[PDB]
């Protein structure tokens, strides 16, 4: 098990408030965030903000699947953003899929996290994305590729906190037993320790 | 869990905690910090800074400074805004936040029910806030504390208004900043800064106003000495 | 015009859903988990001025305007 | 006791008079609800017959009615609210309202700064005066000694207490703020 | 200089009334120079009036 090549770039676009492109290997996702701004009166809430997440694929038009994976991303960012400090305003997250090579949701979560961090939004704790794919026998592989995803009998994706490494989001494909669910959760907890180091080194370099 | 007074000038991350000195103190946490129990929590990236003037008293505030574009109104700031409407007997002005501000016809110098001031739609005004809490639309007055407008009101007749990030504004408004003196050595200039991320410039030639507009947005970066003098010489032309 | 008796689907559609020892053990609450106020006067008993009433009775009684 | 259906013969115009939620035609009294048969004998004979369900799930406001509300947002010249209770009973849905800067005090006076009267998040007791326009729909008023904010809330989530006719104070940090306190 | 200000405030009324005539005819060439005169005439000494104005 070994995470593949990682790269990231910040402040690409001049129009939004914060931009961050996160590509992990061959797959890539671009994201941008507009800071706290005005909100339609029919959707505003007092003592809280409103999070809006929309996802755009590269081929075709969004359907039921993209909104079902938009709820997860919105309900994951909702648990780490201190909205009470900014009521009667709106926070929006937009995700664009540039290339797909496998484990897209984890790269989308990392793109969203780096865009929120770049945009200067009050946050309670950072979050990560780790995807596991155990093969037809039980050999765990971390950060797989669509070649291995096609052959694998089960694919799992987790979102992990940056404080005590708890579980925030979980979407699973395939059938399995609980023992290897525990061992892939432990592998995810072991994997996030390097992504958070990549986060810290990137922001330490930014303020050089 | 590190302690304060030790990680000054160090890049921090959201979710980290730090220990203020021991005997709870009444030091108020700043923008990117929130006080929980007898510890401080970090909610914004940036760099820890502590400012106590000259004495062994308080004398001291904890605030991180980061780079961002979206502006949140703060009470007592000089903010440049642009008029949008003239509804009722007020002047709604766009400052760059979530909601527009609100002037009054008598807020200007020597304004009464008869000698109202001429304010159109789509004009830029220099003025400071007096109420900026998160409970109402912000409201700004535009002359002075005493009542003599010290350069405030409607400004700008033959200049160029551009927009920069909050970092460059913070960097320029420093007592040990030599940016303006050296930049004005080449091209004579006059500036009116705004804490919402806007700058008004007026050089002599339109060409010089274009050059100053382009070369001022890059002074937050491109560190001085080995780079700034050579850079100034190349642009001298 | 005779009314009739129900059948399964209707008699299940019309269902009203309205200590006895301990079961489902792990799901109890104990197993899963100074204030000196110096309070002011508790209410304000309005025993005092209430300005609207003041200005009204004031002007009506006064009734001088000079 | 007997119940009703929204039409039946009840009484003659000589054997009683129509009451609440009823209509009459051709010299007879006809029911208009499915509630209970109530005959208020009162005094003077000829009881005013009426039918009342007595289980009000929803009720439309009127020209004059006492309502419990909840502020949503405040402006320099009005304050949008949400009607929550019609007098006593809970309301299944929520309507909207607007308190102009003339209905705060019982004098319809000048000054009366809206900012420190109806801070958002509070619960107030007010009375309607009209059926309103399409911009402001119910046009509530608090121009009375008994109307105003009744149960406030602290800055940090602590039940608040009345301290005066215009000032309230926090019990924990002893902080002073301005409201429009109604008599209890 | 006691009748000059009164002559001024008499002139400004007729210049304020010629705009309604230029609008009635539909000739804004004059209705524009009357607006310029009206804004060019309003000074601050004229509106001083009395002591306890406000």
The residues near A27 (Cβ < 8 Å, ≥ 6 apart) are: A99, A100, A101, A102, A103, A104, A107
Distances (CA, A) of C63 to C50, C59, C60, D155: 20, 6, 5, 45
> Smallest CA–CA separation between B109 and chain E, in Å?
12
CA-CA distance, B43 to B218, in Å (whole number)?
27
* A167 three-class SS: strand
Give exposure, A68-82, as e/b (b: 16+ Cβ within 10 Å): ebbebbeebbeebbb
Distances (CA, A) of D77 to B184, C4, D46, D100, D114: 47, 63, 51, 6, 7
Cis peptide before B59 (omega within 30 of 0): yes
Chain D residues with CB inside 8 Å of C44's CB? 162-165, 181
Instruction: For chain A, list the strands marked E by DSSP.
Output: 6-10, 18-24, 27-37, 50-56, 90-99, 127-134, 154-161, 167-174
> Smallest CA–CA separation between B137 and chain D, in Å?
8
Residue D53 tokens, joined: 């369900």
Chain E residues with CB inside 8 Å of B108's CB? none
The residues near B97 (Cβ < 8 Å, ≥ 6 apart) are: B71, B72, B73, B138, B196
Given CB atoms, is D119 within the 8 Å cutoff of chain B? Answer: yes
CA-CA distance, D122 to D107, in Å (whole number)?
23
CA-CA distance, B42 to B87, in Å (whole number)?
42
CA-CA distance, D36 to D10, in Å (whole number)?
12
CA-CA distance, C47 to C41, in Å (whole number)?
13
DSSP D156: T
The residues near D34 (Cβ < 8 Å, ≥ 6 apart) are: D3, D4, D5, D6, D53
Given CB atoms, is A166 within the 8 Å cutoff of chain B? Answer: no
**Residue A145: exposed, middle, or buried by beta-carbon count in 10 A (0-12, 13-18, 19+)?**
middle
CA-CA distance, B103 to B152, in Å (whole number)?
13
Give the closest of B15, B46, B134 to A162, CB-based.
B15
Count contacts between B and D (CB, < 8 Å). 12
Among B108, B113, B115, the residue to mutate for chain E (most E Cβ within 10 A): B115
Q: Read out DSSP for B108-126?
A: STT--SSS-----SS-EEE
Chain D residues with CB inside 8 Å of C58's CB? none
Residue B184 — φ and ψ, nearest 5°? Answer: -75, -15
Query: Across the interface, do B14 and A89 touch by the CB < 8 Å criterion?
Result: no
Chain C residues with CB inside 8 Å of D159's CB? none
Given CB atoms, is B176 within the 8 Å cutoff of chain D? Answer: no
Query: Across the interface, do D145 and C52 touch by the CB < 8 Å criterion?
Result: yes
Resolution of the PDB structure in angstroms: 3.7
> Smallest CA–CA separation between E22 and chain B, in Å?
24
Among D79, D80, D115, D116, the residue to mutate for chain B (most B Cβ within 10 A): D115
How many Cα atoms occupy the beta-carbon half-sphere of A179 within 13 Å?
A: 1
Given CB atoms, is B120 within the 8 Å cutoff of chain E? Answer: no
> Smallest CA–CA separation between B80 and chain E, in Å?
27
**Residue E31: exposed, middle, or buried by beta-carbon count in 10 A (0-12, 13-18, 19+)?**
middle
Given CB atoms, is B115 within the 8 Å cutoff of chain E? Answer: yes
Distances (CA, A) of B193 to A131, B76, B209: 48, 14, 16
CA-CA distance, A157 to A160, in Å (whole number)?
10
Chain E residues with CB inside 8 Å of B112's CB? 47, 53-54
* A80 three-class SS: coil
Which residues of E lie closer than 8 Å to B, measured between beta carbons? Answer: 39, 42, 44, 47, 53-54
Place of tokens 């509530």: D140
Query: Across the interface, do D121 and A88 touch by the CB < 8 Å criterion?
Result: no
This structure was determined by cryo-EM
Whether the Cβ atoms of residue A160 and residue A127 lie closer than 8 Å to each other: yes
CA-CA distance, B109 to A130, in Å (whole number)?
62
Among D73, D74, D75, D76, the residue to mutate for chain B (most B Cβ within 10 A): D76
Place of tokens 């007055």: B141
Among candidates A107, A79, A113, which has minimal Cα distance to A93? Answer: A113
* E17 three-class SS: helix
Chain D residues with CB inside 8 Å of B137's CB? 75-76
| Helix (H) or strand (E) run with residue A111 in it | helix A104-119
Among B30, B69, B214, the residue to mutate for chain A (most A Cβ within 10 A): B69
From its phi and psi, is residue D152 left (phi > 0), alpha (psi between -120 and 50) or beta?
Answer: beta
CA-CA distance, A29 to A34, in Å (whole number)?
17
CA-CA distance, B30 to B51, in Å (whole number)?
11
């Amino acid at each position: 098990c070994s995470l593949r090549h990682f790269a990231c770039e910040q402040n690409l676009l001049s129009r939004p408030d914060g931009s961050a492109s996160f590509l992990q290997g061959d797959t890539s996702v671009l994201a941008g965030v507009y800071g706290p701004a005005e909100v339609k009166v029919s959707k505003e809430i007092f003592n809280k903000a409103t999070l809006e997440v929309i996802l755009r694929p590269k081929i075709g038009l969004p359907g039921v699947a993209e909104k079902s994976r938009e709820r997860l991303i919105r309900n994951t960012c909702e648990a780490v953003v201190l909205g009470t400090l900014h009521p009667r305003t709106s926070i929006t997250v937009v995700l664009q899929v540039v290339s797909d090579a496998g484990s897209l949701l984890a790269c989308c979560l990392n793109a969203a996290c780096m865009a929120l961090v770049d945009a200067g939004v009050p946050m309670r704790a950072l979050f990560c994305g780790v995807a596991c794919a155990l093969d037809s026998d039980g050999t765990l592989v971390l950060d797989p590729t669509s070649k291995q995803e096609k052959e694998a009998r089960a694919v799992l994706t987790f979102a992990l906190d940056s404080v005590e490494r708890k579980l925030l989001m979980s979407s699973t494909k395939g059938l399995y037993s609980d023992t290897e669910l525990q061992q892939c959760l432990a592998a995810a907890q072991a994997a996030s320790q390097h992504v958070f180091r990549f986060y810290r080194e990137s922001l330490q370099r930014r303020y050089s | 869990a590190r302690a304060a007074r030790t990680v000054l000038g160090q890049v921090v991350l959201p979710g980290e905690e730090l220990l203020l000195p021991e005997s709870r103190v009444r030091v108020v946490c700043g923008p990117g910090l929130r006080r929980c129990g007898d510890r401080l929590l970090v909610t914004k990236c940036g760099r820890l800074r502590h400012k106590e003037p000259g004495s062994g008293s308080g004398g001291g505030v904890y605030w991180v400074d980061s780079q961002q574009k979206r502006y949140v109104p703060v009470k007592g700031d000089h903010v440049i805004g642009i008029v949008t409407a003239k509804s009722g007997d007020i002047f709604k002005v766009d400052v760059g936040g979530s909601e527009p501000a609100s002037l009054s016809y008598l807020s200007f110098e020597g304004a009464t029910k008869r000698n109202r001031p001429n304010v159109q739609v789509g004009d830029l005004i220099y003025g400071q806030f007096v109420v900026a809490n998160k409970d109402m639309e912000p409201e700004m007055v535009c002359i002075d504390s005493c009542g003599r407008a010290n350069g405030m009101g409607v400004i700008g007749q033959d200049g160029l208004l551009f927009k920069v990030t909050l970092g460059l504004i913070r960097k320029l408004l420093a007592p040990d900043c030599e940016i303006i003196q050296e930049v004005g050595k080449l091209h004579p200039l006059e500036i009116v800064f705004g804490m919402n991320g806007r700058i008004w410039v007026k050089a002599k030639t339109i060409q010089q106003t274009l050059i100053l507009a382009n070369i001022l947005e890059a002074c937050e970066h491109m560190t001085s000495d080995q780079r700034k003098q050579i850079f100034s010489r190349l642009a001298e032309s | 015009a005779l009314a009739a008796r129900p059948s399964a689907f209707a008699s299940t559609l019309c269902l009203r859903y309205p200590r006895t020892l301990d079961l489902y053990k792990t799901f109890l609450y104990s197993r899963q988990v100074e204030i000196s106020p110096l309070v002011a006067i508790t209410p304000f008993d309005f025993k005092s001025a209430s300005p609207d009433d003041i200005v009204k009775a004031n002007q009506k009684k006064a009734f001088t305007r000079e | 006791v007997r119940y009703c259906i929204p039409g039946e013969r009840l009484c003659n115009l000589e054997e009683g008079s129509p009451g609440s939620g009823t209509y009459t035609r051709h010299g007879y009294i006809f029911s208009s609800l499915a509630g209970c048969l109530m005959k208020s004998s009162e005094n003077g004979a000829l009881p005013v017959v009426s039918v009342v369900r007595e289980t009000e799930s929803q009720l439309l406001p009127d020209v004059g009615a006492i309502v419990t509300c909840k502020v949503s947002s405040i402006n320099s010249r009005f304050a949008k609210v949400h009607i929550l209770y019609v007098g006593s009973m809970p309301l299944k849905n929520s309507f909207r309202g607007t308190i102009r800067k003339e209905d705060v005090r019982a004098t319809e006076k000048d000054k009366v700064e809206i900012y420190k009267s109806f801070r958002p998040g509070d619960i107030v007791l007010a009375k309607v005066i009209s059926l309103g326009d399409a911009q402001s729909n119910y046009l509530l008023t608090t121009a009375e000694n008994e109307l105003g904010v009744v149960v406030a809330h602290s800055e940090s989530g602590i039940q608040m207490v009345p301290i005066s006719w215009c000032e309230m104070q926090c019990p924990k940090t002893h902080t002073k703020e301005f409201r429009k306190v109604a008599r209890v | 200089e006691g009748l000059v200000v009164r002559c001024i405030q008499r002139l400004a009324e007729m210049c304020r009334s010629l705009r309604g005539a230029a609008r009635l005819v539909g000739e804004p060439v004059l209705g524009a120079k009357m607006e310029t005169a009206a804004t060019l005439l309003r000074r601050d000494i004229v509106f001083a009036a009395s002591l306890y104005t406000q």
